[PDB]
Amino acid sequence: QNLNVGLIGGGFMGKAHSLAYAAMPMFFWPAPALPVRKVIAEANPELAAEAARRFGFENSTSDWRSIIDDPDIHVVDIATPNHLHAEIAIAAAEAGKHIICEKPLARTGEESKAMYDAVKDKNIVHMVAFNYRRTPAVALAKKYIEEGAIGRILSFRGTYLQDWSADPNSPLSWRFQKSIAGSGALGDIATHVIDMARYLVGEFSAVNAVLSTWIPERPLQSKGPVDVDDEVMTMIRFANGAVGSVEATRNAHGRNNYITFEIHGTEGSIVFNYERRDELQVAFASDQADRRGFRTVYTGPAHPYGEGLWPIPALGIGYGETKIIEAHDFFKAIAEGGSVSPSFADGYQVALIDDAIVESAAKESWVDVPQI
Amino acid sequence: QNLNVGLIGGGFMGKAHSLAYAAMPMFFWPAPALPVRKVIAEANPELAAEAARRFGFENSTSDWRSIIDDPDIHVVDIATPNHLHAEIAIAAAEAGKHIICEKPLARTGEESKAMYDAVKDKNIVHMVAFNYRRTPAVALAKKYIEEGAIGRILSFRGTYLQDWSADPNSPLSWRFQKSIAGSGALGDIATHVIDMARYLVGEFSAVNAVLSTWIPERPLQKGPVDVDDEVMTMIRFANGAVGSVEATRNAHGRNNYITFEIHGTEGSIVFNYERRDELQVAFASDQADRRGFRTVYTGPAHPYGEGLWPIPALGIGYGETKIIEAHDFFKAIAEGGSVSPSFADGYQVALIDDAIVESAAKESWVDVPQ
Amino acid sequence: QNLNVGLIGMGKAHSLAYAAMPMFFWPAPALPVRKVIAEANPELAAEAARRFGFENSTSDWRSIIDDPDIHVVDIATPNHLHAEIAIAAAEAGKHIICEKPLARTGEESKAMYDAVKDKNIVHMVAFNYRRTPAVALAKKYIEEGAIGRILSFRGTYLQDWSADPNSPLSWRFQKSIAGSGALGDIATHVIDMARYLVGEFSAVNAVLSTWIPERPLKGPVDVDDEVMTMIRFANGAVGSVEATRNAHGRNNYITFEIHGTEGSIVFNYERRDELQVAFASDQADRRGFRTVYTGPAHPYGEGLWPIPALGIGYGETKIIEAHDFFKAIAEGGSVSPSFADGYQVALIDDAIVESAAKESWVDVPQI
Amino acid sequence: QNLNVGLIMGKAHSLAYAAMPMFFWPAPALPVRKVIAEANPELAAEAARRFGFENSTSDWRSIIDDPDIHVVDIATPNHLHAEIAIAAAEAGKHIICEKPLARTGEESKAMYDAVKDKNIVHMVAFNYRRTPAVALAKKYIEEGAIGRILSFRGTYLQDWSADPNSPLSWRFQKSIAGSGALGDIATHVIDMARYLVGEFSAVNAVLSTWIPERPLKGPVDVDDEVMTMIRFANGAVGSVEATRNAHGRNNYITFEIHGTEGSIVFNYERRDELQVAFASDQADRRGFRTVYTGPAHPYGEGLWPIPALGIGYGETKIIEAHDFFKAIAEGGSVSPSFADGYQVALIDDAIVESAAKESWVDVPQI
Ligand SMILES: O[C@@H]1[C@@H](O)[C@@H]2OC[C@@H](O2)[C@H]1O
């Protein structure tokens, strides 16, 4: 089963998605379906054609509407900035195409809602690309939790710390522009952590939060106001009684892609650091008193997704393997006419949480999360 | 000069203090003053004798009033549970004695006030035992900060995570009893973190917190647990910086996990007490291609180095923190100067705690009673 | 622009490079074509072709040399067949990459060197790990004198995948086919790192070992499980290297620790995104190993991920290979870890074998 | 009872005596800082008040000749190691003795001979091997928990003498010290190997020196860095390496031990941690466990009530002391004994020769 993909957007993500479509069958064999890089769309025809040569798409187009309207495209992948996710995804749904959309699902909850509405009664597979939950080490922690190996979860600390724009001479790209992005650190990076909280712990009841802009204007390369958050911190109460906290910032010198978490359970703990993604740290309370401690577990054949990755632990998981796994699960769901997680349902829930964080920060009070 | 010490209590903080006295001048020489282990109080006379023999005091007693009524006693050291801090220090105050008291200062901010009031206007050195601040790494952090080497502080994340009581069959000690501890994690370990925040970032403007009790009853020596196992709080600092503090007793694999991460405009600092000897600092001024966290091991080139070990990583333990603390306490007495942190700092911490509890109850931002 | 490839054969790793090389490094030196692939029979070879996405397949590997429309040959066979395929491919004027170790022995390897040394072809051995961005950064550091002149060296490669005696007796455990054990399999990658970072070897003295005598199919192992050699370098530096298969808790632990006159470097491939660099010129109160995450600012970083610690995996390593290999071809220059390097290493292996025989130091036929 | 000590780096030992009973209690024997010696009567008096001795002296002889004292403790450079040890032994004095035991094994012989026939409680200060983490390794091993030992790596990397303008102290002078790194530091690793595996049967090494002249500028005549391989008497193979010219390493005493059914790793820059990987872990959760030392672990009965409250150099020597004073008050032996001390010295000479010619060299195994 060969599926033609139409990739919309050929920036950093275009390359990550193309990589996965190229590589995924080499990894997961026999593959549930073969990706075909059939057509890539970009802002103008020279870029489109150049992106296609670079990523190995057969065709190219200056209009994505060309892809939605082409009946032999089975999969629309949306790798555009956050302002185009909804319009393209709703056209794709109406055209009955299977859809993977990059995060955040959209700019607001209300806009994420329409995308969900347009998809939820169709007979298509819809996905949002929170690829980090498919880091093997994160699946491994999920396995540990679900098999009861750390007891009931008490507590969750999560972070996403970067510094790529800590320098205020960094320009005012779309990530800093509210009307395109919807939010700053919150939508761009905190959403990956929120998804991990949801996957590993469970649903959010309420949030109580603080948003900070540290660099309120930047040069307009290619002096503009930064009307989004640079940093977010929020306390969380979970439906299942767990408590927790998330912190994300663009302004943490010495932190590059420091997605982490620490889960405290009644019978153990789990710690994850994406800058060292090959590793999961786990402490079992049932260890013998003189050999109790976090053990560092390197992922490989023995761990979730091991079958289709590298032959020994620590041969090296990179960004690209997270996207290969994602694609595997997506195309598997299509091949077997099932659903995948996280879906637009998961996407819309994250957008509601985000809105509840913004709300909470304006009112400076606990705000209950709407549960879809 | 030979200052005589009246130690009240010889428990888990029995050998800690007594080591400090015994060893301080060995380390920092010439010494400001020689601590003399004069007398130690415990609850019963046999217990006290046992203690004095062990901790190498000259004398002992069962009544702590004895100590405060002796005019030979230059220094009182309070290492009792939290229910007796106040009454002893207020008495010791009147007796004109120098005081060092364990944390938390008292069970509440009302009880802490008294103690503060009782030393305010008296001409005596008063110290509260937030010893972890005097880990060299944390002094080295203070150094970089106030040097301006990491710029203006944006953010503070601090933790004190433990697991000694994570097992529910762990018995109901005083630390789990509200009326004698005052509070749980908040008092017993959060207070260490709060102080480091006050020390490295500055004063608390306001807090918004959650307290949690996971194991609500424990076997007796079963009885209820009417205190804090875990505390989560966000913070507004008086200086614009934001941050958060998190402490627990129910974190499997966390033993003495006092950490912080500070984010400045020009750099970052990371500390982990489970590896005391190290401080992580990351400078923006580094060349693009050799920029990241540098792991500095502490020794002669760092604060308090001159009177610790001759090379970095020969190793800093719990005892050294107490040695450095003693030195600074006695150097203050010797100079008729003063010391940080004092009962003013302890009182402040007790207000932050009260505001935290008040916050958790109201599920609201509370302004810290400055 | 379009070089046709003929892979013959962990053949996914190579196929990923060819698929993915132009996505990363763009403009591409030359667009690779997965044209043909050979395996031990035509069904497996047709399986391989569907999985790894080659246009065409064969069970007879001579076919691919015999084809003139090929350009590149990629030898991912076990260790007994490198030279046969290498020599044959050389005579056909074929651009070549071959896996490590170059062959079972130095002599076997000598052939391969001569076959190519004369010809008009880019030739390469598959020391991919040296193209880990962190290791390439550690070069940038050493070559600008930033660590001064190199004194000492401690490379390792500790694995544990056959530390169970019940792990079966595959080909990597037969001198017949593997040549050596840990020495040729993995120690070979560290020896190349030594050469690329400090310099040429001068003499070595070694204790080969075997902890697993028999493994199931129950037959004998007739190769080294573990090797430590001591080293004197041409430049005057000192060093030691220790590669094993029997270190429980070690998976793909490729360590090095260089000591220079103005600094140090440590590397751990298990955390390959990091290099640790300690500079003596650091203010004395803020001096120590600093942890550098590789990214755009560092070597090969312009055509990898847009931010550090987004993650480098085994694959990007091989991607950078395919980039430099094809870069050599499309220009006409030459790629470093060549058969020369393969041959030199094979000799170091021979020396090391000798050393553990003669319980003494053994100079190294520098070439 | 009160075992009066005579203390001929000096603040570490004094700390031990002062502190050791409040740690381990009921204590085995309450030490007395009774006499301290040193270069001259000024330094001695100064040192005596600092480290809280009852008396001082400028002649070490006087301490031997004083039959009120119970214990000698040598803390001088290597040149003065021998002529004190014998005298103290003849005098029938209990002994501790800063490593290395002597500038040469030649000399060390006498020191063992002098002791062993009389039933002295006698020791050499290999303090690191009583870091609780290393004790926990011994316990793991002894228990079989990592099965049989196969291989061994050990290190001592330092950088204090890594700037050439660093002064020509007594550790770069052959006649005084005897060995540089080999005997100043590499000796500690040797002791660990000997303790966690077994005896050395043969050795090969390379000595190296990177800074020949220093300010005092005189000439440096000793080994800056030493690299050696090992064959253990039980089959195991090994490596030992130490240097003074390793920028970024401060006090980096380390080992990695591969067992049949596990591995153990130690980094003294983080003494509180032992890293153990048990092969018997389930396959989806297998790897190095970082264990923080506390009550559950060895020596934990008399240290801090919580793991990671923190172990420093001092605690190391408080254990060294309580073992010794435990060995006097019950009368048995103590490892590492002068025996252990001499073996190390022999091992050290083998290494000297090993490097000398460039071939392997058996270890005269006592
Ligand atoms: O999702 C992406 C992350 O992997 C990383 O963080 C910033 C940018 O790159 C973000 O859009």
Ligand SMILES: O[C@@H]1[C@@H](O)[C@@H]2OC[C@@H](O2)[C@H]1O
């Ligand atoms: O034995 C001592 C070591 O613990 C340490 O390293 C140098 C010096 O201090 C040495 O004499």
